[PDB]
């Protein structure tokens, strides 16, 4: 229920991971960012960005035109986790970098569930800072039989704060 996990996608694959995340987590509500709302989203104190990576490396459409109607005020009183998508081997200098664009304006509140580099393979990716992952990091065209165990294991390390 409380924690809001607001997805945006095209094929499909964002919004399968929000929904394996919510039942992994439990008291969650999966909401599309394309029909979201600036009140509906504030409603919320903890929340869980999962966003697919466009071409460029730019946020899907959705998620695009979603953040465009956000400030840096409005993240700065929750708890935010990150969880991106990216296809690492055709777009290997643009590894999952929607994130990033959120991370921009969701640095402004308490971001949680950096993750490790270690198990990809990728040349450049805006969404590492410090050696490390913003958030969580998921592909489902060239690494799908190692999401549910990161989910898991990321659901596990950030579990504690969330509350
Ligand atoms: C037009 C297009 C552009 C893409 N650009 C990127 C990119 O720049 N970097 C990346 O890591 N993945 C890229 N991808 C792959 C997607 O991030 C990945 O397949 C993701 O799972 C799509 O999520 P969705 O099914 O929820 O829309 C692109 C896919 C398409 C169709």
Same mark, same amino acid.
């Given at each position: 229920?409380?924690?809001?996990i607001? !997805?945006?996608? @095209? ?14 987590? *439990?008291?969650?509500? &999966?909401?599309? #960012? ?5 009140? +509906?989203?504030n409603?919320?104190? =903890?929340?869980? $960005? #999962? ?10 459409? @959705?998620?695009? @035109?979603? %953040? ?13 986790? %990150?969880?991106?998508? *990216? ?7 643009? !590894?999952?970098?929607?994130? !990033?664009?959120?991370?921009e304006?969701? =640095?402004?509140?308490?971001? &949680?569930? +950096?993750?490790?580099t ?9 969404? #590492?800072?410090?050696?490390?992952? #913003?958030? $969580? ?8 039989? $190692? ?17």
């Amino acid at each position: 229920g409380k924690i809001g996990i607001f !997805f945006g996608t @095209d094929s499909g694959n964002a919004e399968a991971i929000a929904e394996k995340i919510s039942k992994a987590i *439990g008291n969650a509500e &999966v909401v599309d #960012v394309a029909k979201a709302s600036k009140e +509906q989203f504030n409603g919320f104190t =903890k929340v869980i $960005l #999962v966003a697919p990576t466009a071409g460029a490396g730019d946020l899907q459409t @959705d998620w695009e @035109d979603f %953040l465009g109607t956000l400030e840096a005020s409005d993240f700065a009183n929750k708890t935010i986790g %990150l969880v991106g998508l *990216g296809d690492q081997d055709t777009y290997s200098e643009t !590894f999952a970098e929607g994130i !990033f664009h959120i991370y921009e304006k969701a =640095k402004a509140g308490k971001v &949680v569930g +950096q993750t490790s580099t270690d198990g990809y393979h990728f040349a450049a990716s805006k969404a #590492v800072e410090g050696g490390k992952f #913003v958030g $969580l990091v998921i592909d489902e065209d060239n690494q799908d039989d $190692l999401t549910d165990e990161r989910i898991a294991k990321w659901v596990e390390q950030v579990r504690g704060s969330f509350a």
